[PDB]
Protein: Spectrin alpha chain, non-erythrocytic 1
Organism: Gallus gallus
Amino acid sequence: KELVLALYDYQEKSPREVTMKKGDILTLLNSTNKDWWKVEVGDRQGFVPAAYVKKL
Ligand code: NA
Ligand code: NA
């Protein structure tokens, strides 16, 4: 529903994670966890650290 901004480059470390580039605009899918948010990066879905993204 919401959009988030990738504040840093982040390379996924596990299958459930996804990679993002600084400045990417991600779709926020699930932010119920305080440390890991599920996002859509382009056509991929996965988790990134909440600390590395900013809600828009
Ligand atoms: Na992955
Ligand atoms: Na954040």
About this structure: Strands lie at 2-6, 25-30, 36-41, 44-49, 53-55. Residues 50-51, 53-54 surround sodium ion (ligand 2) (CB under 6 Å). The first strand starts at residue 2 and ends at 6. The domain at 1-56 is CATH 2.30.30.40 (SH3 type barrels.).
